[PDB]
Structure 1
């Protein structure tokens, strides 16, 4: 009754060729952060961040992604 064949071929080349990658300078600190508080009420759960947080300097010499989903579903 039925026959299925799933022959995807891939020969893809995601690629880069950088000569020279230099001299980044990220400076997310320095500033002053004053916070005062009086007579607060918190009747449910609370989160605070204060200061320099979660800062990033990401420098992949490469940095190349490739995603490739195959899916095949049958009833």
Structure 2
């Protein structure tokens, strides 16, 4: 038996921009209240219990190239 594996790939993921400019982000923070008692997390958990977290995530240039190469015998 012979296995063969030659995954080839070219790509120019381009991101041009002249000038973003005057971005603004002016929130009035509201209010949150959680009321739990118990939980039991296990085995690859992520979570958020109450969060007033505003973001400004301005990258000049945003691109993500993902290639999950896999194989099994």
TM-score, with length taken from structure 1 = 0.64
CA deviations over 1:11-61 (Å, ceiling 9, x no partner) = 111111101111111111266899999999999999999998210011000
CA contact (8 A) 1:29 1:52 kept: no
* 2:59 matches 1:60: yes
The runs of 4+ residues in structure 1 deviating greater than 4 Å are 30-52
Cα distance change of structure 1 residues 45 and 29 upon mapping to structure 2, 3 Å threshold:
farther
Aligned to 1:9: 8
Which one has more relative contact order, counting CA pairs under 8 Å at least 6 apart? 1
The structure carrying a bigger strand percent of its residues is 1
TM-score, with length taken from structure 2 = 0.66
Long gaps (5+) in structure 1: none
Aligned to 1:28: 27
Please, which moves more after superposition, 47-56 or 23-32? 47-56
- The number of residue pairs the alignment matches comes to 73
